[PDB]
Design a protein around this nucleic acid. Structure first.
Ligand SMILES: [Mg+2]
Ligand SMILES: [Mg+2]
Ligand SMILES: [Mg+2]
Ligand SMILES: [Mg+2]
Lengths: 5, 9, 6
DNA sequence: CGTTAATTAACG
DNA sequence: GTTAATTAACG
DNA sequence: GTTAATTAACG
DNA sequence: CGTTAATTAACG
DNA sequence: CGTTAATTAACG
DNA sequence: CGTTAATTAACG
């Protein structure tokens, strides 16, 4: 999934 | 940590 | 701050 | 699954 | 032109 | 893959 | 009050 | 599943 | 020397 911020 | 709005549908 | 890629 | 490399969209 | 943020790249 | 709302294009 | 073309995320 | 704070819209 | 209302992209 999307990168952690 | 949210950034800019995504493009709209 | 920039947003999503176009 | 970790991390840096590379890109690009912010500004004015 | 530079910087922060996003996205691509690597094995 | 397709839909329908949004956004960009056009001049 | 301009209108269609192109793009966008959503859906399972 | 669903709150939180950042972002964006609204007003002007 | 702009705040409030509404929206949404973050999270563990
Ligand atoms: Mg400024
Ligand atoms: Mg400045
Ligand atoms: Mg023509
Ligand atoms: Mg008033």
């Amino acid at each position: 999934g999307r990168p952690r911020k | 940590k949210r950034g800019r709005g995504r493009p709209r549908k | 701050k920039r947003g999503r890629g176009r």
